[PDB]
Design a protein around this ligand. Sequence first.
Ligand SMILES: Cc1cn([C@H]2C[C@H](OP(=O)(O)O)[C@@H](COP(=O)(O)O)O2)c(=O)[nH]c1=O
Ligand SMILES: [Ca+2]
Length: 129
Amino acid sequence: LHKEPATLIKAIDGDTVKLMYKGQPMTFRLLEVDTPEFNEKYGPEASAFTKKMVENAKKIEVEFDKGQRTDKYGRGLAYIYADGKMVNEALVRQGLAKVAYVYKGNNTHEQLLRKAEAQAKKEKLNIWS
Ligand SMILES: Cc1cn([C@H]2C[C@H](OP(=O)(O)O)[C@@H](COP(=O)(O)O)O2)c(=O)[nH]c1=O
Ligand SMILES: [Ca+2]
C-alpha cells in the first residue's frame, strides 16, 4: 500500500471526513473502524478527536487498501494519516473507536488496529470504561 496526498475540506464526525483527493471533494470513511454516532455516548469525543487531528495536520494523506475504494454510498474507503500518524489507529488506541467492518479485500492493517484496541481495553479507555 502507498500514501497519496489530500487536503482537508471539513471534519464531519469520528470516522468520516471531507477531503480533496485528486482535486475532487469526496467524503472518506475510515477503513476497519467504527466510531459512535454523534448522538451516542462518546460520539462528541470521537468527533472532537478526529477533528483536532485533521485540522492540526500539516499533511493529510490517504492510503487505499487492495480492495474496494468506494462504498455503496460513494464514500472513499481509506486509512487517513495526519502528519504520518494514522487517524484510524489513533481512535482505536484511545478507545474512541472499535475495530469493525473488516472485509477480506481491505484488511491490510487489521492486526495493527487490533493491537491498539487490545491496549485501549487494557487501559479501560473511554468506550472500554
Ligand atoms: C467501513 C465500511 C463501511 N461500509 C458500509 C457498511 C455499512 O452498511 P449500512 O449502511 O448498510 O449499515 C455502512 C457503515 O458505515 P457507518 O458506520 O458510517 O454507518 O457503510 C462498507 O461498505 N465498507 C467499509 O469498508
Ligand atoms: Ca459510525
